[PDB]
Curated annotation (Swiss-Prot), chain A:
Span covered, complete protein: 127 to 189 of 189
Oligomer and partners: Complex I is composed of 45 different subunits.
Physiological role: Accessory subunit of the mitochondrial membrane respiratory chain NADH dehydrogenase (Complex I), that is believed not to be involved in catalysis. Complex I functions in the transfer of electrons from NADH to the respiratory chain. The immediate electron acceptor for the enzyme is believed to be ubiquinone.
Family of this protein: Belongs to the complex I NDUFB5 subunit family.
Name recorded for this polypeptide: NADH dehydrogenase [ubiquinone] 1 beta subcomplex subunit 5, mitochondrial
Cellular compartment(s): Mitochondrion inner membrane
Organism: Mus musculus (Mouse)
Curated annotation (Swiss-Prot), chain B:
PTM-bearing positions, type Phosphoserine: 19, 149
Gene transcribed to yield this protein: Ndufb10
Organism (species): Mus musculus
Designated name of the protein: NADH dehydrogenase [ubiquinone] 1 beta subcomplex subunit 10
Compositional bias per record (Pro residues), positions renumbered to this chain: 9-19
Subcellular location: Mitochondrion inner membrane
């Protein structure tokens, strides 16, 4: 086919690999920041549920 | 003769005329005349037939000049596209400089063989051109490794320019 086909294919391959490397580094930094301070969707450790707290009036008023 | 005297210089031959002061015949002249009549004429006829066939089926091929892509100096680091294009054009220029060096070496060898016993005197300009091109090649491509690159060549040039600038201070 000629040298231009291999040239442009190499450029496309390099762009794909560079974007993948950038995204991998971004993923590492995002995971580290989330686990350091959990504020995104990931590393959300559980907590006792609100929906099983009895809010009805008790036998004792001081509750 | 695809080659031209502009890139492959050759001084004009100055052969002396014969002065046959002896009466003996010259076996060299007799053998050259017979060699022409026996060997050179049929070979010339065969080559002329071949060239006639080529002129019948004549075709052409071209050179493929490349244009200058942006170099390694004028685009940001980590950009693999610009680095790839600069690396490819630097490897292209490296191969071209290799063949420039080969041309100069061929010219030097031709000068030495042509002049023979007078090579120490009249090959002054060929030796001077060889020395200058050798110095430039050593300045640009010598200490680079087996992984020689545009980045390594740029680093070597920047170090050399820094040393020259520091020497120019005093």
């Amino acid at each position: 086919d000629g040298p231009e086909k291999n040239y442009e294919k190499t450029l496309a391959i390099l762009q794909i690999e560079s974007e993948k490397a950038e995204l991998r580094l971004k993923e590492q930094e995002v995971r580290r920041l989330m686990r350091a301070r959990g504020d995104g969707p990931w590393y959300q450790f559980p907590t006792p549920e609100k929906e099983f707290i009895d809010h009805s009036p008790k036998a004792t008023p001081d509750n | 003769d695809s080659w031209d005297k502009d890139v492959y210089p050759e001084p004009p031959s100055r052969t002396p005329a014969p002065s046959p002061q002896t009466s003996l015949p010259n076996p060299i002249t007799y053998l050259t005349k017979a060699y022409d009549l026996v060997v050179d004429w049929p070979v010339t006829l065969v080559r002329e037939f071949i060239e006639r066939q080529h002129a019948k089926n004549r075709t052409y091929y071209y050179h493929r000049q490349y244009r200058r892509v942006p170099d390694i100096t004028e685009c940001k680091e980590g950009d693999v596209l610009c680095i790839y294009e600069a690396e490819m054009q630097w490897r292209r220029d490296f191969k071209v400089d290799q063949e420039i060096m080969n041309i100069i070496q061929e010219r030097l060898k031709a000068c030495q063989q042509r002049e023979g016993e007078n090579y120490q005197q009249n090959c002054a300009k060929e030796l001077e051109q060889f020395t200058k091109v050798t110095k430039a090649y050593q300045d640009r491509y010598l200490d680079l490794g087996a992984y020689y690159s545009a980045r390594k060549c740029l680093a070597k040039q920047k170090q050399r320019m820094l040393e020259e600038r520091k020497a120019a201070r005093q």
